[PDB]
């Protein structure tokens, strides 16, 4: 058994792999039925295309937290780490494109006495 | 308002809570009774130095511990004013009270006791000079402590003007959380109003 976990700014995904055909399951939907974005499509294709072994794995994803782009990035990173695990020889490839660099960017706290984060109220000289 | 309370700053690492119990539905009644008993205990005894008062309130079990420098006027041989305390706590419906009275081994090493003593010394006739210098010297005689600062504010000396004076010896690192810093505030009454005395005592460091 293989199971991998991905996280992206409050979105958490868990991916299971099968060596089956070139199709994906996202909580019961395919890659086009769910995440109907061409940009997200290329984003998720980027690991497999970089490793140049597309259409060789069937993934099953369980998703929580975040929105479209956050979960898309989380799935991308999770499947990238899963592929690195099953085939370590591709480790010096994704790092060349920086797909192993997890993104440590989140929502900055809204600070009291202000409007939001770094925004400030209007200042009047009189 | 620049320096925050060091005691309240250190409630998460160094200093613990002086009133520990648990409640979910009856928080209002508990806190009302707690402030009532605290005020009654503070008012009933004033000639002695009450350094600390801790309250315990669990289920049917309620008890309180009072720390004083001179327990002789606090626990009688027969318990007369102790019985007065018992009557007062029973009037306000404090149920069973296991009121144990404790003492302090180094009364000169407590911020509250030093503050109180320098307060009456400044109030009666003595200038802030001699009283607070003597308090600092008495604290620095004891070797366990390492630093002290004493501040006084108000109409010092009876003058008609605000005044504030601070004297410091040793190290008083407020900005260190793991610093065993004891803080005490007191007010000395007078015909000119009130004089505030604030004592910081830094006594070594503690590491778990």
């Amino acid at each position: 058994p293989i199971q991998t976990v991905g996280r992206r700014k409050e979105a958490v995904v868990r991916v299971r792999l099968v060596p089956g055909t070139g199709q994906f399951n996202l909580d019961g939907r395919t890659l086009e039925n769910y995440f109907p974005n061409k940009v997200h499509q290329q984003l998720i294709k980027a690991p497999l295309v970089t490793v140049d072994r597309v259409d060789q794995f069937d993934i099953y994803a369980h998703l929580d937290g975040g929105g479209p782009s956050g979960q898309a990035g989380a799935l991308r990173l999770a499947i990238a780490r899963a592929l690195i695990l099953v085939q370590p020889e591709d480790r010096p490839a994704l790092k060349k494109a920086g797909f192993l660099t997890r993104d440590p960017r989140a929502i900055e706290r809204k600070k009291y006495g202000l409007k939001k984060a770094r925004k400030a109220p209007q200042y009047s000289k009189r | 308002g620049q320096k925050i309370n060091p005691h309240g700053f250190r409630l998460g690492i160094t200093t613990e809570w002086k009133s520990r119990w648990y409640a979910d539905k009856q928080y209002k009644d508990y806190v009302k009774e707690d402030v009532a008993i605290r005020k009654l205990l503070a008012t009933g005894l004033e000639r002695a130095g009450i350094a600390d008062v801790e309250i315990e309130r669990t289920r049917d079990r309620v008890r309180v511990d009072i720390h004083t420098a001179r327990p002789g006027i606090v626990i009688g041989r027969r318990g007369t004013e102790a019985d007065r305390i018992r009557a007062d706590l029973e009037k306000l419906t404090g149920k069973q009270v296991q009121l144990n009275i404790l003492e302090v081994k180094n009364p000169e090493s407590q911020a509250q006791l030093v503050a109180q003593g320098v307060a009456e010394q400044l109030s009666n006739r003595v200038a802030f000079r001699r009283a607070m210098r003597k308090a600092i010297q008495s604290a620095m005689r004891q070797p366990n402590v390492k630093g002290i600062r004493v501040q006084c504010s108000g109409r010092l000396g009876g003058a008609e003007m605000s005044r504030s004076e601070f004297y410091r010896e040793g190290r008083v690192p407020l900005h260190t959380l793991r610093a065993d810093i004891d803080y005490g505030l007191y007010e000395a009454k007078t015909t000119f109003g009130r004089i505030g005395v604030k004592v910081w005592i830094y006594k070594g460091d503690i590491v778990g």
Binding site: - | N5, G8, F9, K18, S19, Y27, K28, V31, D34, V35
Partner: protein, 60 residues
Amino acid sequence: AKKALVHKANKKPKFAVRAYTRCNKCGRPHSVYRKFGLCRICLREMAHAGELPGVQKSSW
């Protein structure tokens, strides 16, 4: 608060809506949290005094 106002607050109102907060320690009718029953000033002062079971400085 005037002692008469405090006693009238202690006196239970003759109508349901005629009741208000009347902070316990002092008697400041504004900004009285239902969790404590205290005014915000008194709550802050007592919490910084280390005499409340659970309260502490917030930071995150």
